[PDB]
């Protein structure tokens, strides 16, 4: 029913926030160590695939969210949550999955940074247009803006230092990379135990038919439609995979923050667990596709 414990005190969620921040820092450092700048500039030379993929994602994801909201008879708050979470730009999870499938990594990072930069302006545009009848207010000032630029800095700076280190001192990369890995492991366990401290009652939030169906389709719809549109426009196999997997994934932090700021906690009680569930589903799909992909290259 109501929020478990008291969210006002915020006992340990600061620790969860800082652990996630440091994990993103380490991941972006490793990713920057992975890639090279010349191929990034080459991708900037012909953004045709990148531009069409990005505009296709921003055109299909909000429309798919609106269609799901119309079909599954979600309430106003849940429909707004679907609309906001669906049209969010690509997060670091897509970059980690790109590590998993090791396909055209710098294209993935350029796509995610361009998606964030353009979403900074498209959030009011997409929210004002696609939310007629839900939240009659304009909500053009409730979209986070400091958070988006903070995320942009946190995704560019470690990549910048990694790409500078690799392009000038290529002999010390793997070593520090290995160190990052073990640190990740430690941070990883912290995450889960801290999630326990904030596990609450996620079963109460889960309304099986509508929520489960929306979660099942939306990342799957993104993956499938991105793959199909990449295949249609004559894209490379690595490009196809990375584009499909970037469009399928999204970001959940801004969705949660805007939901918190727009509505009082009592109205959005269970919805506080929606983004987390969203995350715990997309990964549950992501790795699964990887498990298929290896088989696709085994034969």
């Amino acid at each position, epitope marked *: 029913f109501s929020l478990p414990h008291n969210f006002g005190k915020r006992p340990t969620d600061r620790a969860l926030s800082v652990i996630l921040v440091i994990m993103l820092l380490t991941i972006m450092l490793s990713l920057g160590c992975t890639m090279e700048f010349s191929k990034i500039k080459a991708h900037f030379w012909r953004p045709k695939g990148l531009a069409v993929a990005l505009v296709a994602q921003f055109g299909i994801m909000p429309l798919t969210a609106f269609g799901l909201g119309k079909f599954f008879q*979600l309430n*106003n708050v849940e*429909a707004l949550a679907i609309l906001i979470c669906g049209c969010s730009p690509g997060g670091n999870l897509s970059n980690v999955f790109a590590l998993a499938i090791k396909g055209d990594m710098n294209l993935s990072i350029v796509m995610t940074t361009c998606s964030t930069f353009f979403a900074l302006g498209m959030m009011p545009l997409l929210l004002y247009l696609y939310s007629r009848g839900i939240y*009659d207010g304009s909500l053009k000032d409730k979209v986070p803006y400091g958070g988006i630029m903070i995320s942009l800095i946190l995704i560019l700076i470690p990549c910048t230092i990694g790409i500078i280190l690799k392009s000038k001192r290529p002999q010390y990369v793997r070593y520090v990379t290995k160190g990052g890995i073990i640190l990740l492991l430690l941070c990883s366990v912290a995450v889960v135990v801290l999630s326990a401290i904030n596990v609450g009652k996620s079963i109460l939030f889960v309304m099986t038919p509508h929520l489960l169906a929306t979660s099942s389709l939306m990342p799957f719809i993104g993956f499938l439609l991105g793959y199909l549109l990449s295949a249609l426009f004559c894209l490379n196999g690595r490009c196809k995979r990375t584009v499909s997997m970037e469009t399928g994934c999204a970001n959940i932090q801004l969705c949660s923050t805007i939901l918190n700021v727009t509505f009082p906690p009592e*109205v959005i009680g269970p919805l506080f667990f929606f983004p987390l569930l969203y995350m715990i589903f997309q990964v549950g799909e992501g790795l699964l596709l990887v498990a298929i992909f290896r088989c696709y290259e085994k034969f």
Partner: antibody
Amino acid sequence: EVQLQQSGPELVKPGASVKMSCKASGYTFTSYIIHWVKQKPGQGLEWIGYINPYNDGTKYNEKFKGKGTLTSDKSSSTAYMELSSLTSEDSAVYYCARSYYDGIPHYFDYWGQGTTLTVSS
Amino acid sequence: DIVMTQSPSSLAVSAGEKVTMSCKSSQSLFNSRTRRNYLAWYQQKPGQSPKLLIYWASTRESGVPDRFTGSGSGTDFTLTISSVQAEDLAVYYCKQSYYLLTFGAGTKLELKR
């Protein structure tokens, strides 16, 4: 149960600058929004606008956009209305109503006692 | 905007004859996403604050008499009473909240002679 308290009857000269206070202590103030309804004597109800005390979000009707001004106070759990432009025809009964607001105001499930305002010399 | 009009605006029923208040609104104020049919039927006794009777144009607040009942969809709505009595003489407005909060003209109930 929840009840709404109004300031009471008020007489004011046509020089305007009048204030109305509606207090609500029966529930969590920020969870519900407060609408203001105007009723001239014998001409039916008329909506003015609502205020969300959580984010202080005020929405006004087109007719009352120029005159109406809605504010809220969390510490006192109250809502204030100011008009700052009164004529001899503005004498009417004003009600503050509480409505649930998920994304769209549902209905006025509880009303205030209503305060009568008169403008004359 | 949306404007609503109530047709009779005046009725006279003595003891048991059922009443029928209908306001046809202007546009289809029915939500396609959810079958809520945003509409509220209120009651205004003289010298008193309005009291809510029906919400979603089909359901009633707990505690109201069961004689009141409202049925409608799209733009056609109708409030009826199985048996009217002395304290049923009031004014009804059928407010809507689909797009903007607008009230109807109002229907007055009297006692016949």
